Paper text:
The male abnormal 21 (MAB21) like proteins form a sequence related subfamily within the large and diverse family of nucleotidyltransferase (NTase) fold proteins. MAB21L1 is a two lobed, globular protein of a mixed α/β topology with approximate molecular dimensions of 64 Å × 35 Å × 48 Å.
In the loop connecting α1-β1, R62 stacks with the cytosine base in a planar conformation. This loop is better resolved in the MAB21L1:CTP structure, compared to apo MAB21L1, arguing for some sort of induced fit. Backbone interaction between L66 and Y63 and the amino group at C4 of the cytosine explain the preference of MAB21L1 for CTP and ATP, compared to UTP and GTP where no binding affinity was detected. The α-phosphate is coordinated by K255 and R23, the β-phosphate builds salt bridges with K255 and S252 and R23, while the γ-phosphate is held in place by K24 and K248. In summary, CTP binding did not obviously affect the overall conformation of MAB21L1 and the superposition of apo MAB21L1 (crystallized without added nucleotides) and MAB21L1 in complex with CTP reveals no major conformational changes (RMSD 0.94 Å). Obviously CTP did not switch the protein into an active conformation, so CTP is unlikely a physiological activating ligand.
Author numbering: 1 to 59, 61 to 216, 226 to 359
Write the structure that this text describes.
């Protein structure tokens, strides 16, 4: 039985060294060709409207870029601001928050003066709509125009590149020096994880406010990309996450798109709360952690509920038909059974 647990760890590491490493290289190649199209479209916007500056810093990754699928991405476009707005998060719009002007006048003081309502709120929808018109003009004018169209029938700004890749470009503001009320419960009082030292840097990472749709209202959607990534450092956590994203790409890309990489990302964080010790994420525990996550994934699909890690009131399955979730449970179960029954199957997965 030690041989079987050891056998699972061995073949998972081969899977990580082979399929996961190839996946990282292939997506990096796709990201490279997709971002130079995005940079050309965005630099066309910025000449027409300098407030939309391209925050595509390669820094060695592209800041603000998130992978959803081997062919789908989201670029977070961070907008300069003066800092005249107050962050307001009551639970009136779950998973959302609002930016209000600090006192009555000084609307002239803001860079986005025309987008502040009479009530004094900075409108996410008005900013995205203006941004959409600018992008729709850029994709007809830029050098790459033959390979970029803009996706239709959506209020989101999405570029379809070479009829293969889809990129959502989401305007956003970075919020530092504040933790949101909707996330103030975290970290849980009892759970040994993370270390209080780790919590203080995660909260120092801040959070983002994104202009996209969710659930009329027009508020900003909360997002914790940078906090999430700092949270999952240490041990084999990220190696586990990479294996999950790879298995999902190759075997759980299903009709209706019930599962995406962010589901895997959320489950790893919850598995960290269920196993808070650093020794639970030792390299020898890689098989136990992956098994626990896959079974946890099956439970979420069967229960029709997969809560957001920082915003437990939010369900990451909301809007997905139960037939698609049930199909994903049946495929995830059969996948987890094959891996556990014979880890050598990973060679051909
Ligand atoms: N902002 C980003 C995100 C991704 N990538 C590239 O795309 C690959 C796949 O990213 P991801 O879906 O997050 O898979 P991971 O296994 O998590 O890659 P990593 O461990 O490097 O984060 C990464 O290896 C990285 O090289 C990038 O260049 N810039």
């Amino acid at each position: 039985d030690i041989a079987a647990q050891a056998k699972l760890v061995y073949h998972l590491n081969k899977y990580y060294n082979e399929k996961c490493q190839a996946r990282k290289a292939a997506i990096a190649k796709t990201i490279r060709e997709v971002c130079k199209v995005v940079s050309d479209v965005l630099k066309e916007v910025e000449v027409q409207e300098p407030r939309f500056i391209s925050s595509l810093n390669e820094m060695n990754r592209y800041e603000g870029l998130e992978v959803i699928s081997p062919t789908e991405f989201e670029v977070v476009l961070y907008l300069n601001q003066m800092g005249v707005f107050n962050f307001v998060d009551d639970g009136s719009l779950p998973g959302c928050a609002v930016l209000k002007l600090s006192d009555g006048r000084k609307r002239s003081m803001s860079l986005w003066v025309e987008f502040i309502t009479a009530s004094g709120y900075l409108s996410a929808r008005k900013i995205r709509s203006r941004f959409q018109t600018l992008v729709a003009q850029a994709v007809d004018k830029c050098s790459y125009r033959d390979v970029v169209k803009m996706v239709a029938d959506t209020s989101e700004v999405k570029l379809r590149i070479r009829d293969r890749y889809v990129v959502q470009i989401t305007p956003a503001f970075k919020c530092t020096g504040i933790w949101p009320r909707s996330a103030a419960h975290w970290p849980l009082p009892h759970i040994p994880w993370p270390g209080p030292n780790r919590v203080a840097e995660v909260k120092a990472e801040g959070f983002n406010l994104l202009s996209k749709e969710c659930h009329e209202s027009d508020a900003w959607v909360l997002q914790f990309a940078e906090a999430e990534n700092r949270l999952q450092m240490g041990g084999c956590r990220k190696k586990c996450l990479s294996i999950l994203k790879t298995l999902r790409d190759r075997h759980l890309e299903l009709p209706g798109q019930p599962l995406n990489n962010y589901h895997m990302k959320t489950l790893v964080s919850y598995e960290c709360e269920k196993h808070p010790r650093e020794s639970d994420w030792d390299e020898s525990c890689l098989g136990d952690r992956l098994n626990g996550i896959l079974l946890q994934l099956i439970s979420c699909l069967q229960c029709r509920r997969c809560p957001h890690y920082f915003l437990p009131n939010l369900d990451l399955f909301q809007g997905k038909p139960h037939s698609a979730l049930e199909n994903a449970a049946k495929q995830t179960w059969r996948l987890a059974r094959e891996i556990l029954t014979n880890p050598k199957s990973l060679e051909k997965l």
